[PDB]
């Protein structure tokens, strides 16, 4: 039987590309979502039209709370429910917005940014491991050491996620579970963002003066979960077209 | 007027060393504590006997909660209440224990490990800036963050977040003249519950001396980072590990 | 038409697995060697037996000297002479031996270690770029560069230099469509000379499988980096170390 | 009796600041120079005026060659002959210039950039140790991982120096010798650089929109060689005003 993968925030953009490429490679997928029900099912329909009963959806808020552990336990369960196995976990879901040091309460910002980018990936990892070419891939950020201004919580989240990638690689290696990361720089920009401000970020990218397509990010994910990366663990692959190498 | 510092978890060990050294340097100190009331009060006694009206104690739980912001805001408030100013903040307080991936609830482990090592520093940092000359923050990090102990995922994630904060905070608060730096022990004072055999196993790994760092040795680097000799230093983590992080498996 | 690749030190061990896998992927290969004449010619034969006119050998000493630029210019020239193009450069050749601080002269050690591991890669990158599709360079680095073996400073200085090259070359050659990246083994193929308890000592330390990387596992990452699945990857060093660099002392 | 320091390229700018602060701390100093004999001599006189017989100068080209090892052995030897001891070694001398990938020969650029920045520090280290609060301090570069364009050989030099620092810390720790680095970001700008170009770099620095004075860099070196840094080794202290944290 075909292996099975969980992709968090898989309904749109980069997570959608991961789930599609994983499916095109022959995985059965769990498309997690929070708000994008319509887009998630739409993706599942497309994938299932290709091969019947190879894509299911799963809803969960990934914000930190007393219920988070149980939601993450159940995302992993849905993969075992649908497919009888869970070979791959891609922690892609992420909140990202500014939290100046000098309207959500700060405690809610903590809950969303630290929960989605860090704690939920920790809890999903716990449940993944407990339930067992098994690997985990975490969507990190190649700009962590040169962070966006006023983004300290988000940024604290992605650093926490780098530490979890490393800790979990060390601890889960005895179980044959590899744990790795993929770090975009500028991939798909928010439709929210202004076009002028978009081309400002694009022009900074040495390799082609453009952003990464979502497929380019998914390519790194595909490599990491493959047989070609079977000695690779605790590694984080930058996919940033040299953006992080560029001084101020 | 003498400047004033806040040191979190300052009742004993390394935070005591920081507070004492900051006090010997001429600072007034808020000794923040959680459970260690007698040790906190004993230390504020010692320091006030040295210079009257120069040490207070301040109780707070730094576990993450929806009341954490308020608690951190009050820690900073207490320094202004006592001393009319707050020049320096040392984020020393830290919970530290295993959380294996395979009777505390996981929700509580998240709250204590992430709260003490990362969210309280963020919140204290926020409160410190908004209440505002040589202003600086020093975060107690960990030199072994990239070669972590087995099954310390949460603690390690919180120390990594602390590195992230140090950097983001240094960047954002530089315009306000606040510097933000770190001090990363490898092995310093070992746990009180640890047995001497297990301590010596760690001691024997340190290239420089085959011994742990003293609390004064850690405190020395913090005192450098707050001084006028570090006036251009920000976003920097100073490793104080006797070469331990260079030693391969 | 088939693209072509240069692999330094490709007669044996890891560079040989690299050249074999490039060739299976469809590349024509220049097999560079220094002393391993017999092995190099044997490899070209096997590759050519499989697909005709797809492999040449090229001899060069990559020790630093005033003629090293010319030699490196000639290794790149040999690919154009043989195949009409040069698409891929792999910097694999490396001297590796201890150089304690406290019968080769120090002048020679500096020359072999820094030349093979850094200066030759720099000069090759220069000639490659100047002679100029999916063009890319992969340098063979070392995952233990921050946790070096004792008394291996010149070697370690060379590997660090190689990281600096990867990044500086990635930045500068980006506007030319040339990507530059790295593959950093931990313990892979273990030395001929090394005793057998030393090998098992190193093997026990590897979290993932308690074994060293096969030559082919290292080559897989090189192959990924030069493929059309890495078109946005530049200035990245991929560890292929079974988690070894994560194990504390 | 008073301890003694060797400082390389100590005649001008940053190295001169380091020599002076060491001397003010109570060190006797070997002022090394290559071309700047008048400034070296000028410093030694100033310093000997303060304290009789506490400053000497010592000339040596630090470009890589087959005589380099002998030259570095003689710099160390000069401190022993003059003062009877060599407690501190500061590796400050640095060639710095572009070497684009696409009127010196390239082999000479290699020899100057790699020799001054990396090989001479390694030979000076060998000799320092062989001859024995003992410490070495290397002048590194905060911008090593975000290099200036077309500075690959310089950048290769500074990276090697980080590795030396680490390798030397580990190997000389049993002899009680600590090895550390100080990494400037933007410090003293070349005097002949136009103020308008100087200002483009200044403006990039978060902490105060200015470059570090030489004395500011010297301050960190002073720290590292003091009794206040006695457990510190293998460490590189950035002195950069937050410059390296600033994204493109
Ligand atoms: N795009 C870039 O340039 C870039 C750069 C650096 C790093 N990254 C990383 O790459 C990954 C994917 O990036 P992206 O731009 O595709 O992400 P994105 O659009 O910002 O977010 C992806 C998904 O995360 C889910 N999500 C947000 N908040 C959630 C919550 N509270 N609970 C559960 N799910 C939640 C959302 O799902 P729903 O719509 O279903 O609610 C969203 O569609 C992220 O980890 C990101 O941090 C991206
Ligand atoms: N010791 C080392 O070898 C070492 C190594 C690497 C890094 N570090 C770092 O250096 C720092 C100092 O080390 P240390 O060993 O002296 O620390 P520690 O004794 O383990 O902890 C210091 C203090 O943190 C406070 N704390 C714990 N949980 C708290 C909570 N929920 N709320 C508020 N305060 C809490 C405790 O205060 P109360 O007693 O008053 O309850 C404790 O006295 C820490 O940041 C540590 O991570 C130390
Ligand atoms: N093997 C590992 O565990 C390991 C670990 C970390 C990093 N690496 C890196 O991965 C690469 C491959 O490893 P490996 O073990 O296969 O390497 P290796 O066997 O030690 O050396 C590869 C080739 O380098 C060539 N070489 C040595 N000195 C030379 C010189 N002066 N001039 C020109 N060529 C010279 C030799 O060619 P000839 O035989 O023709 O003389 C040799 O076959 C190296 O870059 C190494 O640094 C390997
Ligand atoms: N200034 C900065 O913004 C900055 C930034 C980053 C890092 N740094 C680091 O801090 C250190 C000092 O910087 P700096 O600007 O003061 O230095 P600098 O002016 O560029 O040079 C320092 C001295 O190096 C000596 N030197 C140059 N080539 C030499 C050679 N072939 N042999 C022997 N000595 C040679 C020169 O001595 P003579 O004049 O006597 O010939 C020169 O005065 C360097 O290691 C540098 O890389 C500085
Ligand atoms: C720095 O300017 C940018 C670049 C990319 C984006 C894409 S939205 C996004 C980005 C991210 N790093 N994480 C998450 N979750 N979502 C937004 C602003
Ligand atoms: C590696 O084995 C050790 C070494 C030192 C200690 C000291 S207790 C401690 C340590 C820490 N990194 N953070 C906090 N908060 N407390 C415990 C276990
Ligand atoms: C002391 O531990 C080891 C580990 C691997 C080896 C393989 S031989 C080798 C290694 C290398 N880093 N570079 C080169 N060129 N060849 C030898 C000793
Ligand atoms: C921002 O562009 C600059 C900044 C400072 C300088 C001072 S000269 C210098 C610089 C250096 N890193 N190393 C050495 N040896 N010399 C020149 C250009």
Do residues B232 and D241 lie in contact, with contact meaning Cβ atoms separated by under 8 Å? Answer: yes
C-alpha gyration radius of chain A: 17
- Taking the C-alpha atoms of residue B202 and residue D8, their distance in angstroms, rounded to an integer, is 37
d(CA D138, CA D117): 9
Residue of D147, D151, D248 for testing the chain A interface, max A β-carbons within 10 Å: D248
Pocket of ligand 7 (CB under 6 A): C 94, 96, 142, 149, 187, 190-191
Cα–Cα distance measured from residue D206 to residue D242, given in angstroms and rounded to the nearest whole number: 5
Architecture of domain B1-249: 3-Layer(aba) Sandwich (3.40)
Of D222, D235, D246, the CB nearest to B239: D235
* Residue that the structure tokens 């087959």 belong to: D66
* Experimental method of this PDB entry: X-ray
Nearest to A223 by CA among D197, B157, C130, C231: C231
Q: How far is CA B222 from CA A48, A65, A72, B216, D209, in A?
A: 59, 35, 40, 10, 25
The span from the CA of A188 to the CA of B157, in Å, is 27
Residue C77 CA to residue A211 CA, distance in Å, equals: 35
Which bin fits D5, alpha (ψ -120 to 50), beta or left (φ > 0)? beta
CB D120 within 8 A of CB D72: yes
Structure tokens at A8: 């968090």
* Stretch (H or E) spanning B36: none
Say if ligand 2 is within 6 A of residue B63 CB: yes
> Does the Cβ of D199 fall within 6 Å of ligand 8?
no
B185 forms beta bridges with: B240
Cβ neighbors of A201 (< 8 A, separation 6 or more) are: A186, A189, A211
CA of B92 to the centre of ligand 2 (A): 6
CA A168 to chain centre: 16
Q: CA torsion sign, D146 to D148 to D150 to D154? A: negative
* Nearest Cα to Cα of residue B106 among D107, C12, A127: A127
Residue C155 in marked binding region? yes
Catalytic (active site) residue D154: yes
Residue partners of D56: CB distance under 8 A and separation at least 6: D29, D30, D31, D44, D78, D79, D82
Taking the C-alpha atoms of residue D35 and residue C71, their distance in angstroms, rounded to an integer, is 33
- Cβ-contact C21, C222 below 8 angstroms: yes
Nearest one of A102, D244, C116 to B130, comparing CA atoms: A102
Task: Report the DSSP pairing between strands A178-184 and A135-139.
Answer: parallel
The residues that bridge with C181 in the sheet, in sequence order, are: C138
Give the nearest partner residue to C246 out of B147, B205, B246, using CB atoms.
B147
Q: How far is CA B5 from the centre of its chain?
A: 12
Name residues whose C-beta falls within 8 Å of residue C208's C-beta, 6 or more positions apart in sequence.
A173, A176, A178, A231, A233, C242, C243
C69 lies within 8 A of chain A by CB: no
Q: End-to-end CA distance of chain B: give it in Å, rounded.
A: 51
Mapping DSSP to helix (H, G, I), strand (E, B) and coil, where does residue A7 land?
Answer: strand
Using the Cβ of D2 and the Cβ atoms of chain B, whether some distance falls under 8 Å is answered with: no
The single residue of B27, B155, B176, B232 carrying the catalytic annotation is B155
Distance CA C239, CA C141 (A): 9
- Tokens representing B171 are 């960047």
Distance CA C160, CA C170 (A): 15
- Is the CB of residue D96 below 6 angstroms from any atom belonging to ligand 4? yes
8 A C-beta contact, residue C163 and residue C114: no
Cβ atoms of D107 and D60 within 8 Å: the answer is: no
CA distance B15 to D79: 41
Measured distance CA(D161)–CA(D178) in Å, rounded: 15
Residue D241: count other Cβ atoms within 10 Å of its Cβ: 32
- DSSP label at residue A51: S
Q: Check if A85 has its Cβ closer than 6 Å to any atom of ligand 1.
A: no
DSSP annotation of C26 reads T
**Is residue B76 a contact partner of residue B130, using CB atoms and an 8 Å limit?**
no
Residue A13, classed as helix, strand or coil, is helix
Helix (H, G, I), strand (E, B) or coil at A181: strand
Question: In a 3-state reduction of DSSP, which class is residue C47?
Answer: helix
Listed in order, strand segments (DSSP E) in chain A are: 4-7, 28-33, 55-59, 88-91, 135-139, 178-184, 236-239
Q: Is the dihedral of CA B76, B82, B86, B87 positive or negative?
A: negative
The continuous run of DSSP H or E covering B45 comes out as helix B37-50
C residues 191-230 closer than 8 Å to D (CB): none
Q: What φ, ψ does residue A49 adopt, rounded to 5°?
A: -60, -35
Nearest CA to D177 out of D218, D220, D125, D141 is that of D125
Do C238 and C221 contact (CB within 8 A), yes or no? Answer: yes
Long-range contacts of D44-53 (CB under 8 A, 24+ apart): D47/D19, D47/D20, D47/D23, D50/D23, D51/D23, D53/D28
Nearest ligand to residue B151 Cα: 6
Whether chain C has a CB inside 8 Å of the CB on A23: the answer is no
What DSSP state is assigned to residue C189? S
Tokens of A82: 């649908």
Chain C CA closest to residue A243: C171
Identify the active-site residue in A97, A154, A175, A231.
A154
CB of D220 closer than 8 Å to CB of D182: yes
Cα(A231)–Cα(A176) distance, integer angstroms: 10
User: Between D147, D148, D246, which is nearest A146 by CB?
Assistant: D246
Q: What distance in Å separates residue C146's CA from the closest CA in chain B?
A: 6
Q: What is the dihedral of CA B186, B189, B193, B195, to 10 degrees?
A: 80
CB < 8 Å to B126, chain A: 101-102, 106
How many residues make up chain B in this entry? 249
Which segments within chain B are labelled E, that is strand?
Answer: 4-7, 28-33, 55-59, 88-91, 136-140, 179-185, 237-240
Token duo for residue D62:
């630090």
Residues of A in contact with C170 (CB under 8 A): 206, 242, 245
What are the structural domain ranges in chain A? 1-248
Subunits that touch chain A (at least 3 Cβ pairs < 8 angstroms)? B, C, D
CA distances from B201 to A27, B198, C249 (A): 46, 5, 10
Residue B68 per-residue DSSP state: H
Give the C-alpha separation, A221 to B157, whole Å: 22
Tokens of B205: 């790994």
Closest CA to D7 of D85, D75, D81: D75
Q: Could you tell me if the CB of A41 is within 6 A of ligand 1?
A: no
Q: What is the 3-state secondary structure (H, E, C) of chain D?
A: CCCEEEECCCCCHHHHHHHHHHHHHCCEEEEEECCCHHHHHHHHHHHHHHCCCCEEEEECCCCCCCCHHHHHHHHHHHHHHHHCCCCEEEECCCCCCCCCCCCCCHHHHHHHHHHHHHHHHHHHHHHHHHCCCEEEEEECCCCCCCCCCCCHHHHHHHHHHHHHHHHHHHHHHHHCEEEEEEEECCCCCCCCCCHHHHHHHHCCCCCCCCCCCHHHHHHHHHHHHCHHHCCCCCCEEEECCCHHHCCC
- Helix ranges (H only) for chain C are 13-24, 37-50, 68-83, 106-114, 120-131, 153-173, 196-203, 215-226
Question: Quick one: closest CA in D to C167, which residue?
Answer: D145
**Residue C159 touches chain D, beta carbons under 8 Å:** yes
Candidate from C170, C213, C245 with C-beta closest to A231: C213
CB B55 within 8 A of CB B103: no
- CA of C154, closest CA in chain D: separation in Å? 8
- Distance, CA of C155 to CA of C114 (rounded, Å): 7
CB A5 within 8 A of CB A225: yes
Using N-to-C axis directions, what is the helix angle for C37-50 and C13-24, rounded to 10°? 20
**CA–CA separation, D246 and B170 (whole Å):** 10
Instruction: Identify the residue whose tokens are 């490793």.
Output: B239
Q: Is B30 helix (H, G, I), strand (E, B) or coil?
A: strand
CB atoms under 10 Å from CB of C49, counted, come to 10
Burial class (CB in 10 A: 0-12, 13-18, 19+), D150: middle
What's the CA gap between D57 and D94, in Å, rounded? Answer: 18
CB of residue B191 inside a 6 A radius of ligand 6: yes
Ligand nearest to the CA of C187: 3
The answer, for B237 touching chain A at a CB cutoff of 8 Å, is no
Contacts of residue B203, Cβ cutoff 8 Å, sequence gap at least 6 = B187, B210, B211, B212
Are the C-beta atoms of A114 and A153 separated by less than 8 Å? yes
Q: CB of A241 within 8 A of CB of A184?
A: no
Alpha-carbon span A136 to A120, nearest angstrom? 13
Alpha-carbon distance B14 to B186, whole Å? 13
Chain B nearest-CA residue for D214:
B232
Distance (Å) of CA A40 to CA A23, A34, A37, A70, A92 = 14, 9, 5, 21, 14
CB under 8 Å, gap of 24 or more: what pairs does A197-206 form?
A204/A243, A204/A246, A204/D248, A205/A240, A205/A241, A205/A242, A205/A243, A206/A241, A206/A242, A206/A243, A206/A245, A206/A246, A206/C170, A206/C171, A206/C174, A206/C175, A206/C234
Dihedral of CA atoms C73, C74, C79, C83 in degrees, nearest 10, equals: 120
Structure tokens at C26: 């469809």
Size (chain D), residues: 248
Structure tokens given for C196: 């057998």
Name D203's Cβ contacts closer than 8 Å, sequence gap at least 6: D209
What is the rounded distance in angstroms from the CA atom of residue A48 to the CA atom of residue C150? 56
Decide: helix, strand or coil at residue A138: strand
Nearest CA in chain D to A148: D247
Structure tokens at A206: 């040495």
Please state the φ and ψ torsions of residue A39, each to the nearest 5 degrees.
-70, -40
**Closest residue to C244, CB basis, from B144, B244, B249:** B249
Evaluate: CB of A221 within 6 angstroms of ligand 1: no
Q: Does the CB atom of residue A116 touch ligand 1 within 6 A?
A: yes
Distance CA B147, CA B8 (A): 26
Tokens of C10: 């490709």
Helix B68-83 × helix B120-130 angle, to 10°:
40
Ligand nearest to the CA of C195: 7
CB contact under 8 Å between C159 and D163, yes or no, is yes
- Give A182→chain B minimum CA distance, Å: 17
Looking at the domain covering D1-248, what would its CATH class be? alpha beta
Cα separation, A107 vs A112, in Å, equals 9
Locate C219 and state its tokens: 């080559």
* Per-residue b or e along D90-129, where b marks 16 or more CB atoms closer than 10 Å to that residue's CB: bbbbbbeeebebeeeebbebbbbbbbbbbbbbbbbbbbbb
């Amino acid at each position: 039987e075909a292996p099975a993968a969980v992709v968090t925030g898989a309904a749109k953009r980069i997570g959608r590309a991961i789930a599609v490429k994983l499916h095109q490679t022959g995985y059965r997928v769990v498309i997690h979502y929070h708000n994008s029900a319509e887009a998630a099912v739409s993706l599942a329909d497309e994938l299932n039209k290709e091969r019947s009963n190879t894509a299911v959806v799963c809803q969960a808020d990934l914000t930190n709370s007393n219920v988070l552990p149980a939601s993450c336990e159940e995302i992993i369960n849905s993969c075992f429910r649908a497919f009888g196995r869970c070979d791959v976990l891609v922690n892609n879901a992420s909140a990202f917005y500014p939290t100046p040091l000098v309207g959500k309460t700060v405690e809610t910002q903590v809950a969303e940014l630290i929960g989605t980018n860090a704690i939920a990936p920790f809890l999903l990892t716990m449940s993944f491991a407990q339930r067992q070419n098994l690997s985990i891939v975490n969507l990190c950020d190649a700009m962590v050491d040169q962070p966006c201004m006023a983004f300290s919580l988000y940024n604290m989240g992605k650093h926490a996620l780098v530490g979890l990638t490393q800790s979990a690689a060390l601890e889960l290696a005895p179980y044959g579970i590899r744990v790795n990361g993929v770090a975009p720089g500028v991939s798909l920009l928010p439709v929210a963002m202004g076009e002028e401000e978009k081309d400002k970020w694009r022009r900074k990218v040495p390799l082609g003066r453009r952003e990464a397509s979502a497929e380019q990010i998914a390519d790194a994910v595909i490599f990491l979960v493959s047989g070609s990366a079977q000695y690779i663990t605790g590694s984080i692959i930058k996919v940033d077209g040299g953006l992080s190498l560029v001084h101020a």
